[PDB]
Amino acid sequence: DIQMTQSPSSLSASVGDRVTITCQASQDISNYLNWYQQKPGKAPKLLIYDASNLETGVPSRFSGSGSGTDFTFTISSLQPEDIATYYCQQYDNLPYTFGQGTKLEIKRTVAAPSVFIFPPSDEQLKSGTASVVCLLNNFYPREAKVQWKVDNALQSGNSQESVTEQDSKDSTYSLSSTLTLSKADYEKHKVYACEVTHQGLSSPVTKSFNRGEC
Amino acid sequence: QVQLVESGGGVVQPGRSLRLSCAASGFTFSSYAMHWVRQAPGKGLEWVAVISYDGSNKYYADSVKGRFTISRDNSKNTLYLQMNSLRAEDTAVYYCARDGQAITMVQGVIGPPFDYWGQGTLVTVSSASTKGPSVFPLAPSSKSTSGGTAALGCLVKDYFPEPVTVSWNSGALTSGVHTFPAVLQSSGLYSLSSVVTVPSSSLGTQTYICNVNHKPSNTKVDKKVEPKS
Amino acid sequence: FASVYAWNRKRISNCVADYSVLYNSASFSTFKCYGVSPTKLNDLCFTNVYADSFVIRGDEVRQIAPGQTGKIADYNYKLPDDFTGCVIAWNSNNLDSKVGGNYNYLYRLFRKSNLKPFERDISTEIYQAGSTPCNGVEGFNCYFPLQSYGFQPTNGVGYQPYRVVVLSFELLHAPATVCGPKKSTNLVKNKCVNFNFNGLTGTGVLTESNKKFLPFQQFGRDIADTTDAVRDPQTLEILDITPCSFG
Ligand SMILES: *[C@@H]1O[C@H](CO)[C@@H](O)[C@H](O)[C@H]1NC(C)=O
């Protein structure tokens, strides 16, 4: 007894539209399931019991369709405070499997990032390590690429990124990539560069500095 | 009315043991069922364990068995999950929820399942103590400058005790101030950097001091960010 | 009432059925008619009417309809795809739900294959989900096949018990059977009238008779074969039929 569900994950649309999420179920037909929404930074919330028939409180823009092995959540008339995940739980056995989630994102005009590279502070080079930060400010398409280059060598496996939640004012993203080196290895090269690729850029932007040049 | 409270989680080394607490309120506790569900941070939900109305019907999951156990107090409307033989991998946030629709479990089908009034997390690292945070100022530079604005910030790195905060000018600047999600290194310690943009005419002109506060420890340091020498 | 997994089956037969007392009783929360709209029931005749009875949850009344799916319509009670009768349902929270839970109303939740329409299955064999044989004992992938609604009076609507009756009119190939009721008016004697006496359609003046009809006859005829007397049902008293006045 092992079952699993699927989902067309990570969709995006605009205000006042219709979305669809299809949880196809595994073998061993079942009988209705559920639909949860999860605003991040909080606890989940029930929206529709098996098949359909929502609960109370819900603003009634939601609908299911349960017919055996393939269920479709369908929301009509999008609203600007209804962007969250959406995980569906299937029951009727020992292990209550789940879905995968469905991240939601609004629609904004292509905005290119402001890019900025920061060399390591003199205090940190005393400690014996060098963080090289590169910032990408405001930007719709989050599918941005950050390529570090050290003396024109593409650097793989010594960086970390994180990205902010879509901004409630201008619906943009911001991204910070940190390159971490030892003081010793830092002092072995000259040009540190950060090359950003993005849909709002016709060709990639590189911000760079030269270690040891005021 | 119907609401749940949870406590008992924190930071512990692997191999150890810990029990949790899932209390109830409002409804009659000894008639419903109680579930256990988790999610590793940044992943999906996962059902962990369940028990009937104190009728000893566990039906555990894969791997979980032999490491977890369920204990509810019908007399005191509380429920405990005790786990042993940790893996340094089951660090997550955890939720308990009520059911009234299972089959070999609770008598009679009543209401909807999974009404989800819980919270509560648990860290399983090796940091143990609260590795203080090391701060550097990331100066505004022409490589960050573009036209009318330029960005400057503060890099606060190498700390274990997850909740840490950095403000700008004691909470003054709310424009352009954006703290990025902390990153967890291979060393086991967190790190983050918070940056704010400000008109390029105002590189050094006004005050831009990041106020770093570490609440599990008692670290409070103000660092000024100025253009590069 | 009767469980949902062993519904009852009453075979209403030759009678005078008045579906109006049903249709207008306003006590029914659901009265759907499929083969035939409701108001024309008291004007038709069939061979047999069957009435099935059971008790389900509140939000399971939408699976009692032709062409549905779900734990009830799959394997508890299946309606054929060309149904003819009507489905009636009303809430019964105060009768069937009792504090502490009424665990006497069960339903089947596992079966090998969906039911044929109007098929019934009261067996109680241990279900076998997985491939491992069960040998009549419970365990993983060996489940008892019956569950029980635990009804309780403080349940939100849609979890309170509803009682359901499914009337199914069938027409085999007999000579006749039960049907709607008849309505007779007053007896206006002494006026050229347009009359119908249980089939006899005619026109004329009706008058008290003095002929002695046998103990089984109905009306009277005359040489050259024209109806000239009838017998009234409501009273059973000879009456003559005189043509109108023409000239
Ligand atoms: C018909 O019913 C009336 C009462 O309404 C009764 O007086 C009469 O005797 C009945 N006649 C027959 C033939 O049943």
What is the domain tally of chain A? 2
Number of strands of chain C: 14
Per DSSP, the total helix count of chain C is: 3
Strand content of chain A: 25-35%
Give helix % range of chain A.
under 10%
Assess the beta-strand content of chain C as a share of residues: 25-35%
Question: Numbering strands along the chain, what is their spatial order in the largest sheet of chain C?
Answer: 1-3-9-4-2
How would you describe the shape of chain C? elongated
Question: What about the largest sheet of chain C?
Answer: 5 strands, antiparallel
Content-based structural category of chain A: mainly beta
- The amount of helix of chain C comes to under 10%
Kindly, what is the distance between the CA atoms of the first and last residues of chain C, rounded to a whole number of angstroms?
A: 69 Å
PDB class: viral protein
Keywords: SARS-CoV-2, antibody, viral protein
Entry title: S protein of SARS-CoV-2 in complex bound with P5A-1B6_3B
Chain A: Immunoglobulin kappa variable 1-33,Uncharacterized protein
Can you tell me about this structure?
- The structure is cut from a larger assembly and holds chains A (214 residues), B (229 residues) and C (247 residues).
- Chain A is mainly beta and 214 residues long.
- Chain A has helices spanning 122-127, 183-186; strands at 19-24, 35-38, 45-48, 62-63, 70-75, 85-87, 114-118, 129-137, 145-150, 153-154, 159-163, 175-182, 191-197, 205-210.
- Chain A has two domains: 11-105, Immunoglobulins (Immunoglobulin-like, Sandwich), CATH 2.60.40; 114-210, Immunoglobulin-like (Sandwich), CATH 2.60.40.10.
- Chain A has two helices and 14 strands, in the order βββββββαβββββαββ.
- In chain A, the strands form four sheets. In chain A, strands 7-8-12-11 form a four-stranded antiparallel sheet. A four-stranded antiparallel sheet of chain A has the order 10-9-13-14, with no helix packed on it. In chain A, strands 1-5-4 form a three-stranded antiparallel sheet, with no helix packed on it.
- In chain A, strand 13 and strand 14 form a beta hairpin.
- Chain A is elongated and about 65 Å long.
- Chain B is mainly β and 229 residues long.
- Chain B has two domains: 5-122, Immunoglobulin-like (Sandwich), CATH 2.60.40.10; 134-224, Immunoglobulins (Immunoglobulin-like, Sandwich).
- In chain B, 0% of the residues lie in helices and 39% in strands.
- Chain B has strands at residues 5-7, 18-19, 21-23, 33-39, 46-51, 68-73, 78-83, 92-99, 121-122, 134-138, 149-159, 164-168, 178-179, 183-184, 190-199, 209-214, 219-224.
- The N and C termini of chain B lie far apart (62 Å).
- Chain C is mostly beta strands and 247 residues long.
- Helices cover 6% and strands 31% of the residues of chain C.
- Chain C has three helices and 14 strands.
- Chain C has helices spanning 19-23, 71-75, 93-96; strands at 10-12, 30-33, 48-56, 86-91, 102-108, 127-128, 142-143, 146-151, 162-170, 193-197, 200-208, 220-222, 226-231, 238-242.
- In chain C, the strands form four sheets. In chain C, strands 1-3-9-4-2 form a five-stranded antiparallel sheet, with no helix packed on it. A five-stranded antiparallel sheet of chain C has the order 10-11-14-13-12, with no helix packed on it.
- Chains in contact: A-B, A-C, B-C.
- Chains A and B meet through strand 7, helix 1, strand 8, strand 11 and strand 12 of A and strand 5, strand 10, strand 11 and strand 15 of B.
- The site of 2-acetamido-2-deoxy-beta-D-glucopyranose has 2 residues of chain C, from loops.
- The PDB classes it as viral protein.
- The entry lists the keywords SARS-CoV-2, antibody, viral protein.
- The entry is titled "S protein of SARS-CoV-2 in complex bound with P5A-1B6_3B".
